[PDB]
């Protein structure tokens, strides 16, 4: 996949340092367009970072902070759009990369392709080994309306810099090497030109081009200012529906497209919703209702009768601002099948808050979620009552969509918990986002889950560390039951398999049904043991009944009122 979602933890320290690098790798490997922010923080001195080399565009902002590494391989980065800005100010923030009192710290920026910043400014501070930043003509990189973007640039160093290669147009470079000369694109143009590739008037770029070009065509852009319609840069995407003048009706345009990020698109990508207004979103607008197509596709549509009541999770509607699930809001989930939003359980969830007098949430109360089948956002658990050994309250939970992600990264997170197994036995999908399960000292059955089968795109993975050692779990007999197909389960015993090996009696995976023997006699159906009618007569060695009804027995225990068995005539 060429496209990927960034992150959203800014200067916060990583939740799992042991996995942080590996996380980034899964996130940006081969990625070319970052929907959101590219945050690269706390990277250790010898860290291999080549997974970043394909990135050309960042929708959000770029943050390079608290790193020990000497270089960040971002030579291909062409355009940062600044859809969100760091501290609502900066499109690019390079902070505090240098040893905390041979030496480490970023040495050059080497963003030789960076020629367009649509929105926001630059902040470069406290980087003891950094060179050449004072050298760059920022106003050329800034978009025309951005000239005034604010630019706070610290220069204190702990080393002298070599001079920019004599080869550079000015004395302006992204580093020592001669490949590192800043190419100027906006300021060096013939007439009031937006972007150009050279001094000549015919070297001017197309009006729809963004960073620069290699020709006057809208098919020759280095980036699209607005939308990428299959190589062509355009103001809008070709609309979904055309009005026909010769029939006074609106038949759909076969050329119709959807606006995805900054690119036109045939249909929405996997976890996204298609709107009437022609876009791909992660949320429907007001008056709009989420509707699953007979296939699987999701869509927004207008409500015919004013939209029916719906359960809102944290981060949504009147819970937008709310941080955790507590006694104050637990009721709002009473018998919800689907939660529009997310759920977090923090320590404050479980030890209440006298300052608001919100009572500590009581284990039994967690039973409201027993019906829950779907979460559109994420699920975050950093505290869980020690009296519960697993997360079986979420036994019926099937999908976590991941349309909202904790720290813009994680769709499922379990840390510091003290549960012994998972028990999320219906969980079959993680729509998007990474999963993180760590520092749960007594936790088994992590390896036994087919994470592979649950994910949906290849930028997902399960990061895990510091749980219960695997061979410790087996010593204690905490592994998958005999009867679980392919050795996958969510926990101990035969009610925990992903797929059952033989037959199911309700939820329990069992070797044989009771066809030939056993107290209540059974018939079989789609690998499910099901009970013979109470009026049926049990058999020795032969079959007992052929279906649920009274006409399906081989003999009656009481009276025959053809074709049934009764206790009557």
């Amino acid at each position: 996949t060429q496209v990927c979602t960034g992150t959203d933890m800014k200067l916060r320290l990583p939740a799992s340092p042991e996995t942080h690098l590996d996380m980034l790798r899964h996130l940006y490997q081969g990625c070319q367009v970052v929907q959101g922010n590219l945050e690269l923080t706390y990277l250790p001195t010898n860290a291999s970072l080549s997974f970043l080399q394909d990135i050309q565009e960042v929708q959000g902002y770029v943050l390079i902070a608290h790193n020990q590494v000497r270089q960040v391989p971002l030579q291909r980065l062409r355009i940062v759009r600044g859809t969100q800005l760091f501290e609502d100010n900066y499109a690019l923030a390079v902070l505090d990369n240098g040893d905390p009192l041979s030496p480490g710290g970023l040495r050059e920026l080497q963003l030789r392709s960076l020629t367009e910043i649509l929105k926001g400014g630059v902040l470069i501070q406290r980087n003891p080994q950094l060179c050449y930043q004072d050298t760059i003509l920022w106003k050329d990189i800034f978009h025309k309306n951005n000239q005034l973007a604010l630019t706070l640039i610290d220069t204190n160093r702990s080393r002298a810099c070599h001079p920019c290669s004599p080869m550079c147009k000015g004395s302006r470079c992204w580093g020592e090497s001669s490949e590192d000369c800043q190419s100027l694109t906006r300021t060096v143009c013939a007439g009031g030109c937006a972007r150009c590739k050279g001094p000549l008037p015919t070297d001017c770029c197309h009006e729809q081009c963004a960073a620069g070009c290699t020709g006057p065509k809208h098919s020759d852009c280095l980036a699209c200012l607005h939308f990428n319609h299959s190589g062509i840069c355009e103001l809008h995407c070709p609309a979904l529906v055309t009005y026909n003048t010769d029939t006074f009706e609106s038949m759909p345009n076969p050329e119709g497209r959807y606006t995805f990020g900054a690119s036109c698109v045939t249909a929405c990508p996997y976890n996204y919703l298609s709107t009437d207004v022609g876009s791909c979103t992660l949320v429907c607008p007001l008056h709009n209702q989420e509707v699953t197509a007979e296939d699987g596709t999701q869509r927004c549509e207008k409500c015919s009768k004013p939209c029916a009541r719906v359960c809102y999770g944290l981060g949504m509607e009147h819970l937008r601002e709310v941080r955790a699930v507590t006694s104050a809001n637990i009721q709002e989930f009473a018998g919800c099948k689907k939660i529009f939003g997310s759920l977090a359980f923090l320590p404050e969830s479980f030890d209440g808050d006298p300052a608001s007098n919100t009572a500590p949430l009581q284990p039994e109360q967690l039973q409201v979620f027993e019906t829950l089948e779907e979460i559109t956002g994420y699920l975050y658990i950093s505290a869980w009552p020690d009296s519960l050994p697993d997360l079986s309250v979420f036994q019926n939970l099937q999908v976590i969509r991941g349309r909202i992600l904790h720290n813009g990264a994680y769709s499922l997170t379990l840390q510091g918990l003290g549960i012994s197994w998972l028990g999320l036995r219906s969980l079959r999908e993680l729509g998007s986002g990474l999963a993180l399960i760590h520092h749960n000292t007594h936790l088994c059955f992590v390896h036994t889950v087919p994470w592979d089968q649950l994910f949906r795109n290849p930028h997902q993975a399960l990061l895990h560390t510091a749980n219960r050692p695997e061979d410790e779990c087996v010593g204690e007999g905490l592994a998958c039951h005999q009867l679980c197909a392919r050795g996958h389960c969510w926990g101990p015993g035969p009610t925990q398999c992903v797929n059952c090996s033989q037959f199911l009696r309700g939820q329990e995976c069992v070797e044989e049904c009771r066809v030939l023997q056993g107290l209540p006699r059974e018939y079989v159906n789609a690998r499910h043991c099901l009970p013979c009618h109470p009026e049926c007569q049990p058999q020795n060695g032969s079959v007992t009944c052929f279906g649920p009804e009274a006409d399906q027995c081989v003999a009656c225990a009481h009276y025959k009122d053809p074709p049934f068995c009764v206790a009557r005539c």
Partner: protein
Amino acid sequence: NKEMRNAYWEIALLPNLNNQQKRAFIRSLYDDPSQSANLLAEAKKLNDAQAPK
């Protein structure tokens, strides 16, 4: 199926069992659900034995 989830909550809520004990019972329950009646009584007998006095 409802047989199980009740027993689970039943064991989890007994005031006088510590968590370790509650786990043992819940575990044995998940290992063989048919024993829910036997384990349930077993847990109640110990819960009453450890009643605060």
